[PDB]
RNA sequence: CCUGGGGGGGCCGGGCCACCCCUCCCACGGCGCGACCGCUCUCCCAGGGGGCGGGGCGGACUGUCCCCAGUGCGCCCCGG
């Protein structure tokens, strides 16, 4: 008797950045530089201590 | 003018260009001064370093781990 399908409400809400974005090349290179620089200090402290 | 013939000159004005004396517009060449669009780097500072910088509104992220230090992204107003 009622085969037709009604159109659902299109009303939506604002979107949030739910998923993490990719870090840029500058951020990746800064992470690499930090990992390189903060490694030598560990062995330096272990040697002088 | 020369020996009837031979040789040469002016008329025929007016109009255009141009030899000497001032302006207007296009195409091309360079320089200086302002506006519009896009993207951005040396001058600046406590040589090196901070790279395109200052501030704010918010979020996210990094460290064989000095709990402090450091880098992107969204928007807005300035600097170059
Ligand atoms: Mg010109």
Curated annotation (Swiss-Prot):
Basic residues: bias regions: 10-20
Source organism, top-level taxon: Eukaryota
Annotated region (Disordered), positions in chain: 5-49
Cellular localization per UniProt: Cytoplasm; Nucleus, Nucleolus
Phosphoserine PTM sites in chain numbering: 24
Purpose: Component of the ribosome, a large ribonucleoprotein complex responsible for the synthesis of proteins in the cell. The small ribosomal subunit (SSU) binds messenger RNAs (mRNAs) and translates the encoded message by selecting cognate aminoacyl-transfer RNA (tRNA) molecules. The large subunit (LSU) contains the ribosomal catalytic site termed the peptidyl transferase center (PTC), which catalyzes the formation of peptide bonds, thereby polymerizing the amino acids delivered by tRNAs into a polypeptide chain.
Subunit composition and interactions: Component of the large ribosomal subunit (LSU). Part of the 5S RNP complex, which is a LSU subcomplex composed of the 5S RNA, RPL5 and RPL11. Component of a hexameric 5S RNP precursor complex, composed of 5S RNA, RRS1, RPF2/BXDC1, RPL5, RPL11 and HEATR3; this complex acts as a precursor for ribosome assembly. Interacts with NVL in an ATP-dependent manner. Interacts with RRP1B. Interacts with IPO5, IPO7 and KPNB1; these interactions may be involved in RPL5 nuclear import for the assembly of ribosomal subunits.
Protein family per UniProt: Belongs to the universal ribosomal protein uL18 family.
This protein's name: Large ribosomal subunit protein uL18
Location of this fragment in the whole protein: 249 to 297 of 297
